[PDB]
């Protein structure tokens, strides 16, 4: 009953810098449908087991979704660093929830390159957990002011992946869903079977 299909089977995904978040409530979730479903190359839960999830009830589940390089999936984890964790999507050190990813080369690559998926390459400080930065201000990497115009040491902060289907698997696009589980005073509406 929980519309996980809306998230996992969306036609297109957000760029990692502008990651999407769906709030899930008032429904029944069969997480076993997700885990014992093939072709997830990553399904790692922290603080909970996938099969214990069917026994728990939560007030709210949050599903964050975005696309990254295959090489970057390991950054969607507590305690990791790199351009994605630092500038785009940061999981806290003490994350409770699940990280699910799968190869999306067929959906998100094309010959000549799919340039619609972006990531933040430059930022003055690290994001911290669950912060979302969608600004596109010119990044001033040197000491000369940029006047909002790209130039030497004056960078557009977002760079394209340019996914091509003949890329190596580490340079192929992966779709990622991050589940966060909230238990508040309000009665729990997201339960397993």
């Amino acid at each position, epitope marked *: 009953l929980c519309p996980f299909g809306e998230v996992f089977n969306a*036609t*297109r995904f957000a760029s990692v810098y502008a990651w999407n978040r769906k709030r899930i409530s008032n429904c029944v979730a069969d997480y076993s449908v997700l885990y014992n479903s093939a072709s997830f190359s990553t399904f790692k839960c922290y603080g909970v087991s996938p099969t214990k999830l069917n026994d728990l009830c939560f007030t709210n589940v949050y599903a964050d979704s975005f696309v990254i390089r295959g090489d970057e999936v390991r950054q969607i984890a507590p305690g990791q660093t790199g351009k994605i964790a630092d500038y785009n999507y940061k999981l806290p050190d003490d994350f409770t929830g699940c990280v699910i990813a799968w190869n999306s080369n067929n959906l998100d690559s*094309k010959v000549g390159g*799919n340039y*619609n998926y972006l990531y933040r390459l430059f930022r003055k400080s690290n994001l911290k957990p669950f912060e979302r930065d969608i600004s596109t201000e010119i990044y001033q990497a040197g000491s000369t002011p940029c006047n909002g115009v790209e130039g030497f040491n004056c960078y557009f902060p977002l760079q394209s992946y340019g996914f091509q289907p003949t890329n190596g698997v580490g340079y192929q696009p992966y779709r990622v869903v991050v589940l966060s589980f909230e238990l508040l005073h309000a009665p729990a509406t997201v339960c397993g079977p």
Partner: single-chain antibody, 231 residues
Framework: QVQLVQSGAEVKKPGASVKLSCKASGYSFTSYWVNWVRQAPGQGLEWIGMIHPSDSETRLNQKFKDRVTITVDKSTSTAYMELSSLRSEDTAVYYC????????????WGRGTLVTVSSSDIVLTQSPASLAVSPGQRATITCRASESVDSYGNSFMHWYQQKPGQPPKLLIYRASNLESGIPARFSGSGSGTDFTLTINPVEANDVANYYCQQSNEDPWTFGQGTKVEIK
């Protein structure tokens, strides 16, 4: 040349099976989706499904889930589509068509296979049904969609042209982009749910049918078509 060579026409009894084939050449078979799109008399263009030959990943129109199986043979660069329990409303032209991931407009079209059987989704609405224009005038066709076909800074609305005994031909992709090889008198605009195709100035060779098609959400859907004549 880049082409999709389709199997010949078949005549089937009701309840029988039909397995079409679509052989590709000139490009990297495993780098593109192969779609099946039928032109049914009275119903029009409907997308059946698609398969990516790199790993045979499929995506079916739920209207067809229980009757169609799609398959590929990479060594022969051939896509197959088998539609079962054939009914008289299955009689149609069956095109195979190429599409990029993330885009899913159709830039290369097979000839088509006529199959004859003896004895929710985004709905696209074009107007006018027929338009008469003299050469040198600016012709305008309209396409309206059930919901928005915009997504992530793009409008996934595309325009095609069809002439007799000839598959559709891509003219515009993502609302306003002239497909390479198409003359500059073809023009596209719009956003959200309302889109316009413009031919200016019309030529005697622009007499054809024109269809819009959205690829914002599953399944892909076509409009019912607009005819442009000359007067």
């Amino acid at each position: 040349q880049v082409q999709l060579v389709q199997s010949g026409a078949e005549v089937k009894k009701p309840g029988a099976s039909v397995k079409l084939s679509c052989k590709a050449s000139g490009y990297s078979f495993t780098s593109y989706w192969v779609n099946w799109v039928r032109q049914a008399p009275g119903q029009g263009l409907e997308w059946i499904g698609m398969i990516h030959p790199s790993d045979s990943e499929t995506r079916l129109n739920q209207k067809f889930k229980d009757r169609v199986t799609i398959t590929v043979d990479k060594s022969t660069s051939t896509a197959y589509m088998e539609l079962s329990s054939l009914r008289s409303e299955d009689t149609a032209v069956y095109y195979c068509a190429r599409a990029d991931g993330y885009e899913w407009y159709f830039d290369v079209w097979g000839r088509g296979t006529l199959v004859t059987v003896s004895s929710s989704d985004i709905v696209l609405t074009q107007s006018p049904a027929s338009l008469a224009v003299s050469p040198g005038q600016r012709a305008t066709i309209t396409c309206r969609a059930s919901e928005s076909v915009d997504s992530y800074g793009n409008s996934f609305m595309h325009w095609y042209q069809q002439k007799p005994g000839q598959p559709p031909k891509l003219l515009i992709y993502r609302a306003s982009n002239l497909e390479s090889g198409i003359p500059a008198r073809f023009s596209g605009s719009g956003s959200g749910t309302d889109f316009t195709l413009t031919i200016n100035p019309v030529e005697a060779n622009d007499v054809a049918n024109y269809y819009c098609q959205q690829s914002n959400e599953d399944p892909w859907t076509f409009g019912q078509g607009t005819k442009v004549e000359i007067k």
